[PDB]
Amino acid sequence: MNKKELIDRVAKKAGAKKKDVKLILDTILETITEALAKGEKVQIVGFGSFEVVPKFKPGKALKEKVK
Amino acid sequence: MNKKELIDRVAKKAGAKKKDVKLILDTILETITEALAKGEKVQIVGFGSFEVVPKFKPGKALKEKVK
Numbered sequence: 001m002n003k004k005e006l007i008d009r010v011a012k013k014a015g016a017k018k019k020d021v022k023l024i025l026d027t028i029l030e031t032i033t034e035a036l037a038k039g040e041k042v043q044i045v046g047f048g049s050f051e052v053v054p055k056f057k058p059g060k061a062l063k064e065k066v067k
Numbered sequence: 068m069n070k071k072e073l074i075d076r077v078a079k080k081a082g083a084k085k086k087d088v089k090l091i092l093d094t095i096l097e098t099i100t101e102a103l104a105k106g107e108k109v110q111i112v113g114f115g116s117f118e119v120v121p122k123f124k125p126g127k128a129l130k131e132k133v134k
Binding site: 014031032033041045046048050052063 | 081125
């Protein structure tokens, strides 16, 4: 799946306009990038953590769902 | 930063209600998790790709921004 398909799937599931999903997705990605640029960690419970080269550490729950 | 702080930062930047940002963020995480559970790749231009254990490969743009 690419970014466009991700936006369409999320807009359908949440009952949201694609333009609002794109704004919020882009703002999420910009916020995570800015945090990593300052050396901060972005820890999302039930998914994983982004830290700094950028690295992603999957959470227990994600690993179990993908296992 | 944790998930709550991420939601608050994105809601301020996008001028969106925190409940709407949480709904869209959770739906994005659920959508990525479901794709990975089916063995699909989630490739987001200008950020990176999630693929399958779950792995994240940072994009060129993200690597340049955090170097």
